């Protein structure tokens, strides 16, 4: 039996050397071309344990995306541990591309194909793949964007549902498009639009899955963030190199008992960093229309915990959960 093991996976992508967009530039030096001859082999009569919450693939991806951002998006001023650094801070072209992670000789990536798979415990439909599927390294809070959908029903996953401190990762089975724009010609005012009925239906179906986990006698409530850094109180993300902070109150105020939801957003120059504890200042926004149309494919939630009612709030912050939301079906083993 092949044992789980750590190695440096290599990355593969469709990056182009003639594209100045920063993910492309990073991948042109860090990665190889996307596998021209992918091969998935089913492992007959094999049952394998997985644990999405303890997976070194996540840690490697995290370090890679930190490196990508550090090389690519330079702040004008950075404050870490009382120390200030200043440097040139040019605007860049920024649009994530899919990255695949690949096993080098002596190692294999195992993939769980079980339909209901919660990320931990035994998998009965296991295959080997030369590389993962292509994952866009989207850095965001609250909502997971441009990811992969659950094939059948919505799936919710947690390291321990009974522990209210553990994040719940929701995987949708139907994308909800969200369009965010800072219009052409207040240069920091922006907004996001999404279908009201689609979002309401989404919340209803998530609530059903939550009741299935916590008790059908339970009443499910969504409420906004309880507070903290603006990055986690809002739905925050990077669009076109600019940092958007979108008020998500309307998304997360719901109970069981207009065509579009319009979320107000602000582009901020001073951000709390996700890569390390500290703050960074970037330059004011570029001119012109700044717009991103994204698929909402998942959510990060916390549950209040602590009678008869369960309250859930938008969460996130630790980007390792973003990577886990795509890497949950994979593990690396040593061939012996």
């Amino acid at each position: 039996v092949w044992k789980e093991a750590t190695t440096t996976l290599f990355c593969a992508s469709d990056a182009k050397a003639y594209d100045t967009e920063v993910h492309n530039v990073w991948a042109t030096h860090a990665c190889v071309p996307t596998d021209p001859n992918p091969q998935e082999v089913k492992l007959e009569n094999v049952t394998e344990n997985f644990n999405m919450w303890k997976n070194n693939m996540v840690e490697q991806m995290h370090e890679d995306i930190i490196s990508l951002w550090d090389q690519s998006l330079k702040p004008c001023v950075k404050l870490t541990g009382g120390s200030v650094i200043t440097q040139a801070c040019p605007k860049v072209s920024f649009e994530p591309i899919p990255i695949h992670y690949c096993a080098p000789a002596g190692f294999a990536i195992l993939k769980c194909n079980d339909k209901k798979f919660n990320g931990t415990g035994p998998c009965t439909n296991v295959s080997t793949v030369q590389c993962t599927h292509g994952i866009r390294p989207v850095v965001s809070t609250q909502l997971l964007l441009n990811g992969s959908l659950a094939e059948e029903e919505i799936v919710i996953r947690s390291e321990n549902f009974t522990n209210n401190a553990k994040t719940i990762i929701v995987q949708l089975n139907e994308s909800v498009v969200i369009n965010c724009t800072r219009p052409n010609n207040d240069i920091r005012q922006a907004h996001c639009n999404l279908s009201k009925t689609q979002w309401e239906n989404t919340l209803e179906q998530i609530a059903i899955k939550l009741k299935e986990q916590f008790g059908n006698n339970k009443t499910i409530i969504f409420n906004p963030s309880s507070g903290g850094d603006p990055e986690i109180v809002t739905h925050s993300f990077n669009c076109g190199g600019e940092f958007f902070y979108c008020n998500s109150t309307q998304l997360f105020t719901w109970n069981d008992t207009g065509r579009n939801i319009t979320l107000p957003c602000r582009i901020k120059q001073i951000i709390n960093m996700w890569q390390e504890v500290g703050k960074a200042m970037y330059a004011p926004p570029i001119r012109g229309q700044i717009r991103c149309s994204s698929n909402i494919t998942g959510l990060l939630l916390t549950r209040d915990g602590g009678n008869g009612t369960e309250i859930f709030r938008p969460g996130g912050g630790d980007m390792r959960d973003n990577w886990r939301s795509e890497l949950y079906k994979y593990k690396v083993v040593k061939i012996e």
Binding site: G228, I232, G315
Partner: peptide
């Protein structure tokens, strides 16, 4: 994350603080 200052901030909303990665979250 700065946990102490995170804690120092959240209590003023009536709340405990904890890290969410490199971010401060109130509970």
């Amino acid at each position: 994350x700065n946990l102490h200052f995170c804690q120092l901030r959240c209590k003023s909303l009536g709340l405990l603080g904890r890290c969410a990665x490199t971010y401060c979250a109130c509970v």
